Amino acid sequence: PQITLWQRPLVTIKIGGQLKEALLDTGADDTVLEEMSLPGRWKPKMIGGIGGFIKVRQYDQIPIEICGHKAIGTVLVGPTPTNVIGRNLLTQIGCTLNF
Amino acid sequence: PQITLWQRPLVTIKIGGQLKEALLDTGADDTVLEEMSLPGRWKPKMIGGIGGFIKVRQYDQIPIEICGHKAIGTVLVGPTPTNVIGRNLLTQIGCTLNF
Numbered sequence A, B: 001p002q003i004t005l006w007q008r009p010l011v012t013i014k015i016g017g018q019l020k021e022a023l024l025d026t027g028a029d030d031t032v033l034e035e036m037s038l039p040g041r042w043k044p045k046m047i048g049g050i051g052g053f054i055k056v057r058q059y060d061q062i063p064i065e066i067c068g069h070k071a072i073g074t075v076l077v078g079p080t081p082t083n084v085i086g087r088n089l090l091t092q093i094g095c096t097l098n099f
């Protein structure tokens, strides 16, 4: 698809069999979701945003569908204000910025 | 241009007679720059991201040039950890996400 930016670029993702809404964010290195359960072991990560730093749980090699495009990669889980899909997954689904 | 997302999508902007580097951020409603002087009226605003909120000054109708493309819009100025170009200016240079 081609997504213009007059509204927030919110898309449906699927992860762990569940649909969620998430924001496609080219300004984010990483993908970070609101509290949820994921399988396996996690590692610690501190990520920085506009307001400061939060601690999140890092899960690797997680399957996630983004607008129907399949990806498998690192998902961070923590107290984010919204679900955000960052460049780690945007690259997997072949996203670019164009003007 | 077509901008890949293997790396952070940094561009040069011209604003208030200054050249600055900024991040093209489809997840940002607003454009926020580190402390700088701008002409004209402003009003205070709180903006939120990962890590919580910061207080910024909101300047309206500011001319900016981004990768050779002229636009005009609201620019927020304050203690942001990095310069971000948000959707309010990305729309004006005809920037889209594609995959």
Ligand SMILES: COC(=O)N[C@H](C(=O)NN(CCC[C@@]1(O)Cc2ccc(cc2)C/C=C/CNC(=O)[C@H](C(C)C)NC1=O)Cc1ccc([C@H]2C=S=CC2)cc1)C(C)(C)C
Pocket (backbone or CB within 6 Å): A023, A025, A027, A028, A029, A030, A031, A032, A047, A048, A049, A050, A081, A082, A084, A086, B025, B026, B027, B028, B029, B030, B032, B047, B048, B049, B050, B081, B082, B084
């Ligand atoms: C390299 O680290 C990162 O990629 N951080 C990422 C990130 O925050 N990077 N930044 C992109 C902006 C994040 C976000 O689009 C992400 C975002 C957060 C909240 C919301 C939407 C989108 C809902 C709140 C509504 C309105 N909020 C915003 O639109 C704000 C803008 C006012 C900035 N939008 C955002 O803050 C900008 C940003 C980049 C770097 C840094 C750091 C540099 S040094 C320490 C931090 C801070 C902010 C992230 C998501 C993993 C925490």
Ligand SMILES: [Cl-]
Pocket (backbone or CB within 6 Å): A072, A073, A074, A088, A089
């Ligand atoms: Cl990844």
Ligand SMILES: [Cl-]
Pocket (backbone or CB within 6 Å): B072, B073, B074, B088, B089
């Ligand atoms: Cl504007």
Ligand SMILES: [Cl-]
Pocket (backbone or CB within 6 Å): A004, B094
């Ligand atoms: Cl358009």
